Amino acid sequence: MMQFTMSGTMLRFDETTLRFSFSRDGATWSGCDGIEPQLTREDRSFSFAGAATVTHERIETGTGVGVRSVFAGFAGADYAFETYIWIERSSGDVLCEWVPLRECRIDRVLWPAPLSFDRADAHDVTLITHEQGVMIPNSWPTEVGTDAVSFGGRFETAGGYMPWFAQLRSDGHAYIAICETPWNAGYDIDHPAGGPYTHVGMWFEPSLGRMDYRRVVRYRLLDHADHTAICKTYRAYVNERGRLRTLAEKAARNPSVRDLLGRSWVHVGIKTNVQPDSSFYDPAQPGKNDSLVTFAQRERQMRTLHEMGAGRLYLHLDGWAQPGYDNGHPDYLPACREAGGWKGMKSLIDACHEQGDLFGTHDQYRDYYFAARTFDPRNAIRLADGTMPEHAMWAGGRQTYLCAELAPDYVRRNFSEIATHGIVLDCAYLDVFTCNEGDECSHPEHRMTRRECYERRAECFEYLLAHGILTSSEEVSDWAVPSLVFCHYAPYDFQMRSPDAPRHGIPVPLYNLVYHDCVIQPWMMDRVAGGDDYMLYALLNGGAPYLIRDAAYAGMDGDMTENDIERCAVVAGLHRRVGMQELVRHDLVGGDPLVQRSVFADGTAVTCDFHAQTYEVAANG
Numbered sequence: 001m002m003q004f005t006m007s008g009t010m011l012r013f014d015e016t017t018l019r020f021s022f023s024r025d026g027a028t029w030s031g032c033d034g035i036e037p038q039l040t041r042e043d044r045s046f047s048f049a050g051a052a053t054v055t056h057e058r059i060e061t062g063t064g065v066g067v068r069s070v071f072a073g074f075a076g077a078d079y080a081f082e083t084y085i086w087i088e089r090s091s092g093d094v095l096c097e098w099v100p101l102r103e104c105r106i107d108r109v110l111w112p113a114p115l116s117f118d119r120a121d122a123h124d125v126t127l128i129t130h131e132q133g134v135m136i137p138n139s140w141p142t143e144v145g146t147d148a149v150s151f152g153g154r155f156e157t158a159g160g161y162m163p164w165f166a167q168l169r170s171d172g173h174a175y176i177a178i179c180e181t182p183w184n185a186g187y188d189i190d191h192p193a194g195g196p197y198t199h200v201g202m203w204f205e206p207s208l209g210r211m212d213y214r215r216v217v218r219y220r221l222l223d224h225a226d227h228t229a230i231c232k233t234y235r236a237y238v239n240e241r242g243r244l245r246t247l248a249e250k251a252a253r254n255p256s257v258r259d260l261l262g263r264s265w266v267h268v269g270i271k272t273n274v275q276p277d278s279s280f281y282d283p284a285q286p287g288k289n290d291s292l293v294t295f296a297q298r299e300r301q302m303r304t305l306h307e308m309g310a311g312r313l314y315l316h317l318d319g320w321a322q323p324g325y326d327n328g329h330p331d332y333l334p335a336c337r338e339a340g341g342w343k344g345m346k347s348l349i350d351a352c353h354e355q356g357d358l359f360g361t362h363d364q365y366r367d368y369y370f371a372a373r374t375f376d377p378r379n380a381i382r383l384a385d386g387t388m389p390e391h392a393m394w395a396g397g398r399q400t401y402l403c404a405e406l407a408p409d410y411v412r413r414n415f416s417e418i419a420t421h422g423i424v425l426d427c428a429y430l431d432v433f434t435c436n437e438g439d440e441c442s443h444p445e446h447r448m449t450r451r452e453c454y455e456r457r458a459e460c461f462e463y464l465l466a467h468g469i470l471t472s473s474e475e476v477s478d479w480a481v482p483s484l485v486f487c488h489y490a491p492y493d494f495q496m497r498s499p500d501a502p503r504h505g506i507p508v509p510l511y512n513l514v515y516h517d518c519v520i521q522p523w524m525m526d527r528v529a530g531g532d533d534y535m536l537y538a539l540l541n542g543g544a545p546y547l548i549r550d551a552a553y554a555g556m557d558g559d560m561t562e563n564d565i566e567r568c569a570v571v572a573g574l575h576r577r578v579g580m581q582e583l584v585r586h587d588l589v590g591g592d593p594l595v596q597r598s599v600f601a602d603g604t605a606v607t608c609d610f611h612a613q614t615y616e617v618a619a620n621g
């Protein structure tokens, strides 16, 4: 009904239906029939078309053309907002803006409506950033819904490592929807079992109980596209906004960055101390609740691994402080006395250094345990309704969350304490920051939006990098790329579920296609009986190997072979070569999902065959 044509792109918008479509290179995409943009409230969902008053305005500006719509009055309530949908002159992109105008609650906004993608074509695929990456054919036999996606499909979490989703038709015509305001946003996915469609749509939540700021989505219509090309679209978007911070850039400040290339990872612990109120407590099993390996025993194990030719190692050490793993944070001091104290910890670190190996502590600044020495609810998060959240899931029992406004204060305190004891960490791990969503806090003394929370968590990382301590956290949610050197992993979703559970799609390294040259990742080395050797995904992603990966809690943290040292050497060998390079291309060879190739900046090419369970590392290209 309203039609616009600008820079190779056409936008069509119907004033009654509120449906739109856009075209470029002769491909047209439209809103799904029968799926209208929604406001959800505690009391009910409304279509935008449900407003008392809806006006439209045709618009041309120095930068684009399009339509701005104002919507006012819902049920009997004076609530208003406006949208703006437009083509950008310089690019042909289509931009969608939702702008709050009057608010006086709204739970969620589902907008823009998903696009139609309804051919059971099997080469018609949807890309989502749920962990390392998933490509979902329209014919895929297993159901995929938002409630099977981590964190409800929230961006800036394991559910949405990057703020985008994309759909790719078999003819190479595709779109990528980039959420430019991702901090109170996420995606919704609907793929019924066998299809024949997959619908993917943005959602937006209020910030501290108000929609507050403009929400923006940017669509780019691509042609001759494949999944590699879609990823590079978002890579350029990010570098254009200054957030593509390469390892090389990081190395110019902290040359020790390069010293992670080719290391094999060791993840093991010291003190376990499961409290009676913990959900993990086993009341009939004292030896299970309460265990200890000393610093000396870990020192001997490091000497031994070295003596056996394990090679260049990085040791991440759990549960090294007095309260025990997952107890007492942020009061997670001093080094555990029964393990050997500061003396034994220092001796262990020295032994690592003496043998050319690197050392990092597992630490935690979000979980705030009532048993912390200085526990005070005044330092805790308050939710938008003013409640203090609480649970007793982990080893240390009853907890709330520490408001991230204050987390840098605690990081500064604890790390400067550690340093005064002749402990010189090569690295540090601040758990959960890069897996879980950023908190919001309505406490007047430390009010914080989700967006500010990510900034404060980055500030904690910055403290470490300023002291020459390389930074790690749980996963790789891309808010963190400017300030994060490495992670605990950046696994595929399927590696985090039983190998028996059906998958949601074909595994593809969407995150590495964007960020391989920015964040270092170790990789699970496990073999599935009757299934995949996880080594192969480590090679496709050009990552480091886990030599030892002890679970903190049985069944958690992707807790599911005899030549370990040898298998590591092959992975590390590659990593030492391509650890700092772009992952340029990834392909399903011949379109076969079970045959995959990755190509790095220096031409090195990695082919993995999941029929044969075999690999091949060539320099050809």
Ligand SMILES: CC(=O)N[C@@H]1[C@@H](O)[C@@H](O)[C@@H](CO)O[C@@H]1O
Residues within 6 Å of the ligand: 326, 367, 394, 431, 432, 474, 488, 552, 553, 556, 557
């Ligand atoms: C891999 C990893 O360290 N996972 C940990 C888990 O073991 C537990 O400590 C939790 C507490 O919030 O934080 C992370 O999820």
Ligand SMILES: [Ca+2]
Residues within 6 Å of the ligand: 267, 316, 317, 318, 362
């Ligand atoms: Ca750990």
Ligand SMILES: [Zn+2]
Residues within 6 Å of the ligand: 380, 381, 382, 403, 404, 405, 441, 442, 443, 445, 446, 447, 448
């Ligand atoms: Zn606060």
